Structure 1
Amino acid sequence: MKFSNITIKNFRNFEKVNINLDNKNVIFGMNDIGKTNFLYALRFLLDKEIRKFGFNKSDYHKHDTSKKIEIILTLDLSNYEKDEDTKKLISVVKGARTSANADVFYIALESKYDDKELYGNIILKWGSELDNLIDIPGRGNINALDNVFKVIYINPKIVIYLIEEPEISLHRSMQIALSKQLFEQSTYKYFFLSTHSPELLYEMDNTRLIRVHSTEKVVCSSHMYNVNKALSSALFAERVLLIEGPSEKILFEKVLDEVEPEYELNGGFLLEVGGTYFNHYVCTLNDLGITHIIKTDNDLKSKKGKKGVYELLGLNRCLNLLGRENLDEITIDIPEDIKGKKKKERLNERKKEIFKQYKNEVGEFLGERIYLSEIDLENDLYSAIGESMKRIFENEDPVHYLQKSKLFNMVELVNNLSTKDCFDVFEHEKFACLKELVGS
């Protein structure tokens, strides 16, 4: 009884599309024209108050020719034993089943000859096979299809809901209450929800994501959702850059609005993880067709029980994202001396030798969407705008000046930064994580 797919041929934006469905469907995307045409395709198939006006000239493909519109719904009916809705659809259809063991049923909408009397005319045919479809019998204004289904449309009998953007002029907690009410109540068994707000999509289970695109053909991507608050604003994006901390984010929001400031309208997003852990995020983004991009920094860690033996932490966190094996450990000797500045200067010079030692493995990290820095953000930020960093802080060592307060000295660099400097950050050879987010 759970709906298999819909085939739309010659409608107002479509040429040949086959959108897989189930119950509880969510439609999003960039263009609103394809989302309105998807819900009006369901309204022309299953609602009589749109279907009684017929088709206009604008309801065909573009505005002229290809004068044969099919909208076909395929239900995947099968045997659900004594069921409330399935035995109802056995009971009203009756004689249009060609066999008693058929596990599929078709509802087809045909339209032809727009050019004669300026009128579309819509013919609805039942049938469990693609050949020998039987016409739906009706006496007056009422078909026998209208005894089965009922369509309720929301915009600011098996019941189908069609909801278009309920986030307009409501509070966000009312969107959270609508988000729980769409998935715990059994009266919202079948819907098609069009939305932009992330608060309607916090809790979500067993849901076909239908993504429409900005192309003129409009192709649709259809994905199953089975089982989070950070991912809800990243559900509406195709490309997600996964970054570690807020100091990365303030720099990237200053660069990405001074180079290409409409990146999130095109479908890019900046996602925080709050640490160095990406494997809980990339399995969620991989199942939903969202292209993750990972930016992380190379780190070293001292080993417990051994003095001088250091383990390769930032390399192994990219090897565990690929399912690979860990590396063997290194040995650094460090004297007593002072451990404030000089110990960090030994540990930078070891990590550069590591980063040139495993450069062909950095290459197969970068063949996937994992980008690993040489040391940190603050040291390859110094490799681009290091002539501009000494003027702002009035200091000889600006990396050590950012090392004291990582975010508070970052926002003083952000608040005094020129327009040409963001191109120098963005066009660097080591800031290539940004170039895969914008898609250029």
Structure 2
Amino acid sequence: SSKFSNITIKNFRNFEKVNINLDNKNVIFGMNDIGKTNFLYALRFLLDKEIRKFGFNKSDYHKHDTSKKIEIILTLDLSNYEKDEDTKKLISVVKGARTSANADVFYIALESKYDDKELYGNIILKWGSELDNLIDIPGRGNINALDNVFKVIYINPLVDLDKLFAQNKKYIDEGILNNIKSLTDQVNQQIGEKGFQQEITSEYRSLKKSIELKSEMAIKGFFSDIIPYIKDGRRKMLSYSIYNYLAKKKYEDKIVIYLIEEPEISLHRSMQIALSKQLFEQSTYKYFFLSTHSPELLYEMDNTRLIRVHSTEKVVCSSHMYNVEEAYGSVKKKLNKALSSALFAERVLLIEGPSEKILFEKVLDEVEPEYELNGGFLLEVGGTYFNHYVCTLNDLGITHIIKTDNDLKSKKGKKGVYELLGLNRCLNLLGRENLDEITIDIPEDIKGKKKKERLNERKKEIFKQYKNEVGEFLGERIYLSEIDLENDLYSAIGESMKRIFENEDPVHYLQKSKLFNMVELVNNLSTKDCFDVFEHEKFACLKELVGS
């Protein structure tokens, strides 16, 4: 359902052989800053006439090897031709280069072979329906048929608004203009109305065989300079405001593709969210490619493809089609802001709530305070299932770790029925179906602390029944507690928790106020306590997060 299928880059700079799936809206990010920039340049060379005329240098070839040929192919999908207007744009120019047998697909390729004597390898653009017999894109002079289809707008991080406005002023009443024109000449008559015009001529005439020297603008009219005025960081957003209005009117007849590199540069965090809303929520930017290091620039992300360039020197690329389902729509904004910062990390530990974050932040601080520097990240997920977070992180090649409590949820409208919520979420990551809800018989005289302890006994009983299902969880880096985190914490530092709280049952007291008591616990936690919790088998997720 997207015109842009995938792009292939062969032997171009650090790209040995890289295949990346695509969509209308694409966002690229990762550690390799060189790979992200070369990715945008590889798209410009294929589609931007100004950057393509310069040809390939020796450095652009992969590993500076001129024998290997540079090849950049863009695969397109024309299946939605019946209801896509921009698809008909491409068809009208391609004409007979398509075949009816493969009418759904169309290829746009860039081939380059290097000449030693000419010290210069030219760029030959081919297209066609079949990848085997691509034909040269027809052209006459400095323009070809491809330049009539696609117009590439590259938004530099740093831009002067007055300079770009001078480019758009020309194309963007008459009886009124005539009065302004005659009045413009009225300026020059009053300016001359005098001692300098006559003395510079007497000096010029003796020097060289009328020197009036009027004033600019009045010669060419008021339209020559019409720079804007509002009523550094603020004017950057007005340049985007010009781009939206300009490109639609100027390039309505062709497909416009935006290449936005690092737009968060010299931009406030609040404006980054404003730009993110305009990129995804608004239909103003139909097709763009975005390179960003800013998590706040993805707060409003939806219906986009996320491309992650790996930190390795091989320049491996992992792409994910990020789409928020309608069921998650009521918590979409909360979910995106938490996941946006996790895309840039290397290992993400899925925790439930803030009480786990308060504990883990203190424990990690004593054991390994540089865990975020090396790519670790604590992502808290509350109320929702793990599938949306795991699918996005898995496709992007990000190591995901899950630590959740074994919980039971009472079904509404019926008493005595409890859903196996803790197991179902871990089973959902493995693709298995939700387990049947169970009914446990608790007497009416058993309430409060006595009631909770009996429910814990069912959790331990349920945990033992699915002993093999837990075995599959550990292979998938899923860590399901027997009862909950507080009981696993008691197993690691029971002597410390009893001394810290002086209460004979520290687990019961910790769960009274989970946030406050966890803060009270971490304040009195010893350094050996943090190492004991870290080294304990029940907390293997902390060892997997640091990556030892």
Q: 1:54 to 1:358 in 2, by over 3 A?
A: closer
Q: Give the match's secondary structure for 2:61.
A: coil
Query: In the TM superposition, what whole-angstrom CA distance separates every residue of 1:222-259 from its partner, at most 9, and x where no partner exists?
Result: 33233944333334456543322211111112233444
Deviates more, 1:141-150 or 1:66-75: 141-150
Deviation at residue 281 of structure 1 after TM alignment? 5.3
Deviates more, 1:192-201 or 1:283-292: 283-292
Query: In the TM superposition, what whole-angstrom CA distance separates every residue of 1:103-161 from its partner, at most 9, and x where no partner exists?
Result: 43332222222643443332223333334433344444333432322211113232111
Alpha-carbon distance in structure 1 between the residues aligned to 2:432 and 2:106: 47
Q: 1:43 to 1:325 in 2, by over 3 A?
A: closer
Q: 1:265 to 1:379 in 2, by over 3 A?
A: same
What corresponds to 1:58 in structure 2?
59
Deviation at residue 331 of structure 1 after TM alignment? 11
Q: Give the match's secondary structure for 2:436.
A: coil
Q: Give the match's secondary structure for 2:426.
A: helix
Deviation at residue 26 of structure 1 after TM alignment? 1.7
Conserved in 2, the CA contact under 8 Å of 1:276 and 1:296? Answer: no
Deviation at residue 212 of structure 1 after TM alignment? 1.6
Q: 1:344 to 1:57 in 2, by over 3 A?
A: same
Deviation at residue 348 of structure 1 after TM alignment? 5.7
What corresponds to 1:218 in structure 2?
315
Deviation at residue 13 of structure 1 after TM alignment? 1.2
Deviation at residue 32 of structure 1 after TM alignment? 1.7
Alpha-carbon distance in structure 2 between the residues aligned to 1:400 and 1:124: 71
Conserved in 2, the CA contact under 8 Å of 1:67 and 1:114? Answer: no
5+ long unaligned stretches in structure 1:
none
Alpha-carbon distance in structure 2 between the residues aligned to 1:195 and 1:344: 48
Q: Give the match's secondary structure for 1:276.
A: coil
- The 5-angstrom pairing of residues 384-395 of structure 1 reads 384-390=492-498, 392-393=500-501
Alpha-carbon distance in structure 2 between the residues aligned to 1:100 and 1:339: 72
What corresponds to 1:162 in structure 2?
259
Conserved in 1, the CA contact under 8 Å of 2:347 and 2:545? Answer: yes
Conserved in 2, the CA contact under 8 Å of 1:10 and 1:66? Answer: no
Alpha-carbon distance in structure 2 between the residues aligned to 1:136 and 1:323: 47
Query: In the TM superposition, what whole-angstrom CA distance separates every residue of 1:169-219 from its partner, at most 9, and x where no partner exists?
Result: 323332232222223544422111112333332334432222221222222
Deviates more, 1:267-276 or 1:66-75: 267-276
How many residues align? The count is 439
Query: In the TM superposition, what whole-angstrom CA distance separates every residue of 1:329-348 from its partner, at most 9, and x where no partner exists?
Result: 99999999997777766666
5+ long unaligned stretches in structure 2:
158-253, 324-334
Deviation at residue 35 of structure 1 after TM alignment? 0.9
Q: 1:77 to 1:286 in 2, by over 3 A?
A: same
Q: 1:145 to 1:408 in 2, by over 3 A?
A: same
Alpha-carbon distance in structure 1 between the residues aligned to 2:515 and 2:107: 60
Conserved in 1, the CA contact under 8 Å of 2:393 and 2:400? Answer: yes
Deviation at residue 395 of structure 1 after TM alignment? 6.2
Greater fraction of residues in helix: 2
Conserved in 1, the CA contact under 8 Å of 2:318 and 2:395? Answer: no
Q: 1:435 to 1:137 in 2, by over 3 A?
A: same
Conserved in 2, the CA contact under 8 Å of 1:211 and 1:221? Answer: yes
- The 5-angstrom pairing of residues 308-327 of structure 1 reads 314-315=422-423, 318=426
Q: 1:402 to 1:45 in 2, by over 3 A?
A: same
Q: Give the match's secondary structure for 1:132.
A: coil
Deviates more, 1:381-390 or 1:346-355: 346-355
Q: Give the match's secondary structure for 1:230.
A: helix
Deviation at residue 287 of structure 1 after TM alignment? 7.5
Deviates more, 1:378-387 or 1:261-270: 261-270
Deviation at residue 38 of structure 1 after TM alignment? 0.5
| Greater Rg by CA | 2
Deviation at residue 14 of structure 1 after TM alignment? 1.2
Query: In the TM superposition, what whole-angstrom CA distance separates every residue of 1:378-408 from its partner, at most 9, and x where no partner exists?
Result: 2221222334445555666544553443222
Q: 1:25 to 1:397 in 2, by over 3 A?
A: same
Q: 1:133 to 1:241 in 2, by over 3 A?
A: same
Q: 1:345 to 1:286 in 2, by over 3 A?
A: same
Q: 1:128 to 1:355 in 2, by over 3 A?
A: closer
Deviates more, 1:213-222 or 1:397-406: 397-406
Deviates more, 1:84-93 or 1:152-161: 84-93
Query: In the TM superposition, what whole-angstrom CA distance separates every residue of 1:292-337 from its partner, at most 9, and x where no partner exists?
Result: 5332223468999999999866456656766768889999999999
Alpha-carbon distance in structure 2 between the residues aligned to 1:365 and 1:64: 47
Alpha-carbon distance in structure 1 between the residues aligned to 2:472 and 2:25: 40
Q: Is residue 405 of structure 2 the alignment partner of residue 404 of structure 1?
A: no
What corresponds to 2:137 in structure 1?
136
Q: 1:43 to 1:373 in 2, by over 3 A?
A: same
Which one of the candidate residues 318, 321, 338 is aligned to 1:230?
Answer: 338
Conserved in 1, the CA contact under 8 Å of 2:322 and 2:392? Answer: no
Deviation at residue 162 of structure 1 after TM alignment? 0.4
Taking structure 2 as the reference length, the TM-score comes to: 0.67
Query: In the TM superposition, what whole-angstrom CA distance separates every residue of 1:334-373 from its partner, at most 9, and x where no partner exists?
Result: 9999977777666666755664565344334434443222
Deviation at residue 4 of structure 1 after TM alignment? 2.0
Q: 1:204 to 1:300 in 2, by over 3 A?
A: closer
Alpha-carbon distance in structure 2 between the residues aligned to 1:310 and 1:164: 51
Q: 1:338 to 1:35 in 2, by over 3 A?
A: same
What corresponds to 2:31 in structure 1?
30
Deviates more, 1:33-42 or 1:67-76: 67-76
Alpha-carbon distance in structure 1 between the residues aligned to 2:133 and 2:446: 88
Backbone CA RMSD of aligned residues:
4.2
Conserved in 1, the CA contact under 8 Å of 2:408 and 2:418? Answer: yes
Deviation at residue 99 of structure 1 after TM alignment? 6.5
Q: 1:331 to 1:82 in 2, by over 3 A?
A: closer
Deviates more, 1:301-310 or 1:353-362: 301-310
Deviates more, 1:154-163 or 1:273-282: 273-282
Q: 1:121 to 1:258 in 2, by over 3 A?
A: farther
Deviates more, 1:62-71 or 1:400-409: 400-409
Q: Give the match's secondary structure for 1:203.
A: coil
Q: Give the match's secondary structure for 2:338.
A: coil
Q: 1:279 to 1:139 in 2, by over 3 A?
A: closer
